[PDB]
Structure formats: structure tokens, C-alpha cells
């Protein structure tokens, strides 16, 4: 895997700031169901979809990327909901993601 660092500038969509991608995974989920991971014991957070033309795509995020950190916060041992919350803080317009890519 290769380390990538992406800088997402969230888009205003109504009252919300959106990122333009979807996630799967988390320590509370069944890792054997993750179609993207090389190691099916990997309980990490993975990008499962990327919106064409959205903030994530523009920043260079790709389907299947594993999210290691968001704004310096470790994402390797969090629940699915904890990951969702970290990525979607309404006070944060810019989020930097450290990811690994196969």
C-alpha cells in the first residue's frame, strides 16, 4: 500500500457541509464483509463510494482507500459512528485525510 494525503474542502449543501464520499467499516462491524480490504481481519474505515465531481473526488480520494487519520485523529480503531462524526464536524470546513491505497 501507498500513503496518500488529501485535503478536502467541504461543500455547503443546505445547512450541512458535505464531503462527497461514503464509508464502511469500524471496530463494531464485521470485517469479513468488507469487499475492499486486502486483509479481511482489517476493521478499519474504508471509502466505499466517491461522488463524481464532489469535494472528495476533487481532493484525490479514491474508492477503496483506507482512512488512517482525519485532521490528526487516529481512525484505525474507532467505531463506524465515531468515524462518521469525526469526518462531519460542522465547524470544520477543511479536513485532511491520511489514507493508504493499494
Amino acid at each position: 500500500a501507498v500513503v496518500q494525503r488529501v485535503e478536502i474542502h467541504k461543500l455547503r449543501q443546505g445547512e450541512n457541509l458535505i464531503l462527497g464520499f461514503s464509508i464502511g467499516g469500524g471496530i463494531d462491524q464485521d470485517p469479513s464483509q468488507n469487499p475492499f480490504s486486502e486483509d479481511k481481519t482489517d476493521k478499519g474505515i474504508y471509502v466505499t463510494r466517491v461522488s463524481e465531481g464532489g469535494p472528495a473526488e476533487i481532493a484525490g480520494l479514491q474508492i477503496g482507500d483506507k482512512i488512517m487519520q482525519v485532521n490528526g485523529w487516529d481512525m484505525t480503531m474507532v467505531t463506524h459512528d465515531q468515524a462518521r462524526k469525526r469526518l462531519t464536524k460542522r465547524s470544520e470546513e477543511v479536513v485532511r485525510l491520511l489514507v493508504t491505497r493499494q
Binding site: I18, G24, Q29, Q33, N34, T48, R49, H80
Partner: peptide, 8 residues
């Protein structure tokens, strides 16, 4: 189904 995803 047994593996939820979330839109962000």
C-alpha cells in the same frame, strides 16, 4: 446489508 455504509 450486514455491512452498513454512510454518506458523508
Amino acid at each position: 446489508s450486514r455491512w452498513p455504509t454512510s454518506i458523508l
